[PDB]
Amino acid sequence: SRKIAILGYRSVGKSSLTIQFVEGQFVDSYDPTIENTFTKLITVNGQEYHLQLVDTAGQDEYSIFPQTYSIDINGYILVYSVTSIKSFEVIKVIHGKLLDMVGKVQIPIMLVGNKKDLHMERVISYEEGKALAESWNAAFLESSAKENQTAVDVFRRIILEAEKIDGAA
Ligand SMILES: Nc1nc2c(ncn2[C@@H]2O[C@H](COP(=O)(O)OP(=O)(O)O)[C@@H](O)[C@H]2O)c(=O)[nH]1
Ligand SMILES: [Mg+2]
Numbered sequence: 001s002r003k004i005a006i007l008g009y010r011s012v013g014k015s016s017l018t019i020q021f022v023e024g025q026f027v028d029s030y031d032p033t034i035e036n037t038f039t040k041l042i043t044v045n046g047q048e049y050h051l052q053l054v055d056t057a058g059q060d061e062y063s064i065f066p067q068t069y070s071i072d073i074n075g076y077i078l079v080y081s082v083t084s085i086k087s088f089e090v091i092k093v094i095h096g097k098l099l100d101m102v103g104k105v106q107i108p109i110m111l112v113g114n115k116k117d118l119h120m121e122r123v124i125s126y127e128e129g130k131a132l133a134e135s136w137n138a139a140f141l142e143s144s145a146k147e148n149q150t151a152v153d154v155f156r157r158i159i160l161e162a163e164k165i166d167g168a169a
Contacts, residue, residue, distance in 0.1 A: 004075030016145030109138030116144035
């Protein structure tokens with residue numbers, strides 16, 4: 001049982017992949033940007049896995065200081081956009097600090113790149129992102145809400161690293 005926190009700029013497509021991922025199905029999904037908690041129970045290798053993710057925007061991209069973000073999770077999935085130097089740079093910021101705040105051990109970190117159909121432009125480099133995810137020992141993933149297959153790939157790849165990071169902490 002681990003809850004993964006979602007950190008994605010505005011209209012980055014959080015709610016889109018949150019619904020497409022959790023359900024594992026690309027549905028119409030065309031609502032505003034409401035915050036909430038989601039859940040996804042699945043079995044990997046016969047082993048049960050219960051994940052719960054949240055999409056919030058209290059103040060900052062996610063606010064490091066007390067602001068309803070004092071949840072009790074055990075995961076983190078930051079969504080970076082292949083078009084918003086803002087989405088990926090802030091994600092790298094909130095992380096640096098956040099990490100610095102908890103000063104804990106290796107926790108499940110997932111760097112997912114949403115809005116893949118935009119990658120056609122790819123403003124951020126797969127590398128820079130690689131070195132980043134490698135820095136925190138996180139996994140770098142690039143998918144699209146409008147695409148299930150990609151999502152799925154993010155579901156397995158994450159649970160996987162989730163395993164490694166678990167061995168550490
Ligand atoms: N091109 C593209 N747009 C997406 C994708 N996922 C969501 N979006 C966009 O996200 C925008 C806002 O919806 P939403 O999912 O609520 O983003 P959120 O405000 O960050 O949660 C809409 O303009 C959607 O087109 C995607 O996979 N590809
Ligand atoms: Mg939203």
